[PDB]
Amino acid sequence: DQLSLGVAAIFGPSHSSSANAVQSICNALGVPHIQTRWKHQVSDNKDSFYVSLYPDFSSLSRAILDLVQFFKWKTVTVVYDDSTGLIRLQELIKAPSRYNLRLKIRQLPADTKDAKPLLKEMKRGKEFHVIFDCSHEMAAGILK
Amino acid sequence: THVLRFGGIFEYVESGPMGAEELAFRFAVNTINRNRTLLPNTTLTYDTQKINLYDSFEASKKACDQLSLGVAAIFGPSHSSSANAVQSICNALGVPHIQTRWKHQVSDNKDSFYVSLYPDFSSLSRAILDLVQFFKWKTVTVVYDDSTGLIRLQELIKAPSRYNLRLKIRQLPADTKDAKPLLKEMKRGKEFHVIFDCSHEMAAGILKQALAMGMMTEYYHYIFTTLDLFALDVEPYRYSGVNMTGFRILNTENTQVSSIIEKWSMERLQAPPKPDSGLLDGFMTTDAALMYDAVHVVSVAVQQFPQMTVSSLQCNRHKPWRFGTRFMSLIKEAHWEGLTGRITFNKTNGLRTDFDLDVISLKEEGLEKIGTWDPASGLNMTESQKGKPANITDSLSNRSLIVTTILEEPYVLFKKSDKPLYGNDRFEGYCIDLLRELSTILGFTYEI
Amino acid sequence: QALAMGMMTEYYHYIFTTLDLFALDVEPYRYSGVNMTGFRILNTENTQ
Ligand SMILES: *[C@@H]1O[C@H](CO)[C@@H](O[C@@H]2O[C@H](CO)[C@@H](O)[C@H](O)[C@H]2NC(C)=O)[C@H](O)[C@H]1NC(C)=O
Ligand SMILES: *[C@@H]1O[C@H](CO)[C@@H](O)[C@H](O)[C@H]1NC(C)=O
Ligand SMILES: *[C@@H]1O[C@H](CO)[C@@H](O)[C@H](O)[C@H]1NC(C)=O
Ligand SMILES: *[C@@H]1O[C@H](CO)[C@@H](O)[C@H](O)[C@H]1NC(C)=O
Ligand SMILES: *[C@@H]1O[C@H](CO)[C@@H](O)[C@H](O)[C@H]1NC(C)=O
């Protein structure tokens, strides 16, 4: 209803699923789709009518790896919120092949904010080098 | 009396005859119409049409064309991006969206009208986890194929906190099947345990290169994930001694099932697989298994519910259909038995969490059941406990080995705690050790 | 048939005897790690 109305620069949703609909809209008709949040590429899609200005997790997940090298850690305890977030960290999970990192990946609980049992388990496990991976609205609630 | 029009979306078969899911779907429409036991006074029909699996707009046109034609259930495409297009069609109108493919589920995707008969990796990866306590490993080296691999095994990747392991997750190279630089690093890593996680087509492709990389010894103890492990031409690997354990859902231990599978392979004499692939020729893929198991589950639903019919609803004017709010509650409450055995959905989210499995492994004769898994019960595995054969403890070399014993200190002093006990520990000392120290070397159950 | 019975590791070493070992289809075995040290009298390292 914007395309039949006549537009030039669809700027897309901010979500995974509703993006890939409007991208394949924008592949057929020819209008550029322009994204803002990172979505999950399916790696075999022939779509090239899209750009995405979210900083790609190809390089962010690599940049985190260099910054854990810098601190010379051994016992990182990677924590995410949604299963998409594990894909957002692939250069860190593949690292124990390369280096002597020893991850222990553990998940913020579903349908809630309650990060007590995480931190309950996290204290007794004696880990101290934890990487979070969650939205900043979520993230402030853990530190509370 | 009524036709109850089905259809849906399938793979485009650019110059080949037909894709293997679509053959099962027409074979499912056939089989119910012959056997009149299922479905009184009705028949079934289908409107199949193809997409490129990556063009959701092609799917969203071709879905709503069948909706404008009027269907009774869209049976959906077979790809993640093309699912969520047709997923959101069936949420909008109320028609069901019976799937045969695991897709990524968005965590906040508030939908109702869909099921997916492919067993959830929420449960399935607990089963792969259930083996590595049974096989008593420590040093798993999970190998995914693309970025959706590492999201499937999330219950496996969240292991090493407990059941203690040491995960070294590494990735198959994209854009090729050249796993030689990948496997060469695994050899110098001494990584003798690995949970290959890909299709069966890749699972032939790595082994056939892992055979040339000298990785197929009696040391290496592969575990696959694909539910068509019983479709590999395992014949060249069979004598070597490789322990490629795995899974299947497709129960070949039923006459009625295996009759269909050979009735199938006569129908799909059309489209033979090319020989050098490393794959077999006559085999039910587990996708075409779930596709044929799907239409039964819908057919047993309309058995449970008459008077269901076809209206023609239009995506241009968003309107809830009529019957789906009744009828989706029929589908989600189903307990059909089929090619995958106990189809039973989940009264929560429309997945498949309860299902039975066989654990098949490569013994020297071939693939062979070594037990049964389900969400309860853990690994019920018929180990057929060794140390039996026609014997107990050699029965004459170890009769009771009755030993003439005097109590003398420090040789045999006396073993007391309180409250008179028995066995060989009625006495203790230097010779009582030399009883068991001569027994620890050779092996004989002795008696004072 | 050594390959189909998993004896083509990095541990084995098969000295062949025949004087045609060079003319053998060594391509699937090559990457593995057997060291099939054999012989040749044929002198293919000479242009004429
Ligand atoms: C790895 O494989 C060997 C043989 O491939 C396993 O040994 C078993 O050996 C008996 C002979 O006494 C055979 O009859 C069985 O069929 C073999 N079992 C299997 C599953 O192949 C050995 O137990 C395996 N070990 C590990 C750690 O996987
Ligand atoms: C039709 O299916 C039913 C199962 O509901 C079975 O009992 C019956 O034997 C089948 N008919 C034939 C001819 O196989
Ligand atoms: C339809 O099937 C029913 C059984 O449910 C049977 O009684 C009836 O004779 C059949 N035919 C018609 C025309 O209704
Ligand atoms: C339904 O799905 C949830 C989420 O996976 C699962 O925990 C639950 O046990 C399922 N219900 C049944 C009947 O098992
Ligand atoms: C499964 O059940 C018990 C152990 O759970 C065992 O006795 C039985 O033999 C197993 N197998 C079958 C086919 O019931």
Residue numbers in the entry:
A (entry chain A): 97 to 240
B (entry chain B): 33 to 480
C (entry chain D): 241 to 288
Authors' description from the paper:
Particles representing GluK2 with no ConA bound yielded two structures, GluK2Glu-4fold, which has a nearly four-fold symmetrical LBD layer, and an apparently asymmetric structure, GluK2Glu-asym. Both structures revealed Glu but not BPAM molecules bound to the LBDs, despite incubation of the sample with saturating BPAM concentration. Although the A–D subunit LBD dimer in GluK2Glu-asym is preserved, the interface between protomers is severely altered compared with the GluK2BPAM and GluK2Glu–ConA–BPAM structures. Indeed, the D1–D1 interface in the A–D LBD dimer of GluK2Glu-asym undergoes rupture, resulting in marked separation of the D1 lobes compared with GluK2BPAM and GluK2Glu–ConA–BPAM. This rupture of the interface that harbours BPAM molecules in GluK2BPAM and GluK2Glu–ConA–BPAM distorts BPAM binding sites and explains why this PAM is not bound to the GluK2Glu-asym A–D LBD dimer. Of note, during the D1–D1 interface rupture, the GluK2Glu-asym A–D LBD dimer loses its two-fold rotational symmetry, a defining aspect of GluK2BPAM and GluK2Glu–ConA–BPAM structures. The pores in Glu-bound GluK2Glu-4fold and GluK2Glu-asym appear to be non-conducting, consistent with these being desensitized ionotropic glutamate receptors. The states represented by the GluK2Glu-4fold and GluK2Glu-asym structures remain unresolved. These structures might represent different stages of desensitization, with GluK2Glu-asym being an intermediate state.
Kainate receptors, a subclass of ionotropic glutamate receptors, are tetrameric ligand-gated ion channels that mediate excitatory neurotransmission. Here we present cryo-electron microscopy structures of the kainate receptor GluK2 in the presence of the agonist glutamate and the positive allosteric modulators lectin concanavalin A and BPAM344. Concanavalin A and BPAM344 inhibit kainate receptor desensitization and prolong activation by acting as a spacer between the amino-terminal and ligand-binding domains and a stabilizer of the ligand-binding domain dimer interface, respectively.
